[PDB]
Amino acid sequence: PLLEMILITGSNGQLGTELRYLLDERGVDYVAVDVAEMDITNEDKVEAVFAQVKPTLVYHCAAYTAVDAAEDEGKALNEAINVTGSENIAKACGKYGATLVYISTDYVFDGNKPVGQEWVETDHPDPKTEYGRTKRLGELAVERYAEHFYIIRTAWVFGNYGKNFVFTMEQLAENHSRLTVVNDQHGRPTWTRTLAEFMCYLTENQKAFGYYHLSNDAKEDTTWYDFAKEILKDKAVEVVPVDSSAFPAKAKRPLNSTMNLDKAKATGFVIPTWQEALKAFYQQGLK
């Protein structure tokens, strides 16, 4: 009751690493676990860590995020991590009375919203990808078992501390002169630093429990193509805009998953545009 005790799961991924370093800057202590310390798919290992740590606040950064793979070769792994693992951590948090910050996805929505319109927290999820379906089940487990929760739906996540679309683009551009990127899937990038700061803003300021949408912002419509054009603008590659029909993709990704950020902005947190965040990401990567 008098001591805050933070646990970070998925601590060595792009978001978990970002979050560790942010807490380190703020002089905040924590216990950090990932797959080599606490397999979230094994309820007994999860219980043993919570019994030792006795957390009051858990930032759950563990997820499976390979969308195409989740439809086929990774379908079993996607389900274990996003369904079972989410349930296990939600139940552990409820047992121990811990607040759970659960990171979810814009891919819970069906994506059938005109360009220009945006998804709000109270819209009904109806995911059409296996990844999104599993993440929605995770949300439902959190709501059932963790009385004190923040579910933060984020999008298109990138940062300096793990794999993502930015590094994929840069690697491909080293050896290939032409890349084809969809220009009919609308959404917004999210820098891990902005997301980690928002996670901490909710908890530091004890905002109302519930659901919050968080991506970086944009004044104008944004597609994957727009993001890739910007990332690669200093490279000798041509980024070619294509439609989603151009090549046979395994997952039917949402055509418009742009989130309304008004609730997040109502917290007082200030959200950079994705252009600003990308620039900051490049500067932070110099260290």
Pairing of strands 210-213, 149-154: parallel
Pairing of strands 157-158, 190-191: parallel
User: What is the DSSP annotation of the chain?
Assistant: --S--EEEESTTSHHHHHHHHHHHHTT---EE--TTT--TT-HHHHHHHHHHH--SEEEE------HHHHTTTTHHHHHIIIIIIHHHHHHHHHHHT-EEEEEEEGGGS---S-TT--B-TTSPP---SHHHHHHHHHHHHHHHH-SSEEEEEE-SEE-TTS--HHHHHHHHHHH-SEEEEESS-B---EEHHHHHHHHHHHHHTTPPSEEEE---B-SS--BHHHHHHHHTTTSS-EEEEE-TTSS--SS---SB-PBP-HHHHHTTPPPPBHHHHHHHHHHHHT-
Long-range Cβ pairs for the range 19-23 (8 Å, 24+): 19/59, 19/61, 19/192, 19/196, 19/199, 19/200, 21/161, 22/193, 22/196, 22/197, 22/200, 23/200
Pairing of strands 6-9, 57-60: parallel
Alpha carbon distance 107, 130 (integer Å):
10
CB distance 240 to 179 below 8 Å: yes
Q: Which of 131, 150, 161, 211 is catalytic?
A: 131
Q: In degrees, to the nearest 5, what angle opens at C-alpha 233 toward C-alphas 232 and 238?
A: 70
Alpha carbon distance 3, 108 (integer Å):
35
Domain 1-164+188-217+258-272 has CATH 3.30.479.30: no
Where are the chain's structural domains? Answer: 1-164+188-217+258-272, 165-187+218-257+273-287
| Size (the chain), residues | 287
Alpha carbon distance 103, 36 (integer Å):
21
Q: What was the structure determination method?
A: X-ray
- As assigned by CATH, the class of the 165-187+218-257+273-287 domain is alpha beta
CA 7 vs. chain centroid, Å, equals 18
Structure token pair of residue 212: 């919050």
User: Could you tell me which of 159, 128, 165, 224 has the C-alpha nearest to residue 16?
Assistant: 159
Classify burial at 262, counting beta carbons within 10 Å of its beta carbon; exposed 0-12, middle 13-18, buried 19 or more. exposed
Alpha carbon distance 86, 63 (integer Å):
8
Q: At residue 129, what is the residue type?
A: T
Q: Which residues contact 130 (CB under 8 A, 6 or more apart)?
A: 67, 70, 71, 75, 78, 251
Alpha carbon distance 262, 120 (integer Å):
8
Q: Which residues contact 163 (CB under 8 A, 6 or more apart)?
A: 14
How many other CB atoms sit within 10 Å of the CB of residue 175?
7
Alpha carbon distance 215, 194 (integer Å):
8
User: Could you tell me which of 111, 231, 103, 108 has the C-alpha nearest to residue 165?
Assistant: 231
Catalytic residue check, 131 = yes
Alpha carbon distance 188, 154 (integer Å):
9
Q: Is the dihedral of CA 262, 264, 267, 269 positive or negative?
A: negative
Classify burial at 61, counting beta carbons within 10 Å of its beta carbon; exposed 0-12, middle 13-18, buried 19 or more. buried
> Resolution, rounded to a tenth of an Å?
1.1
165-187+218-257+273-287 shares the fold of 1-164+188-217+258-272: no
User: What is the DSSP annotation of 235-266?
Assistant: SS-EEEEE-TTSS--SS---SB-PBP-HHHHH
Alpha carbon distance 23, 7 (integer Å):
12
CA 125 vs. chain centroid, Å, equals 16
Alpha carbon distance 89, 81 (integer Å):
11
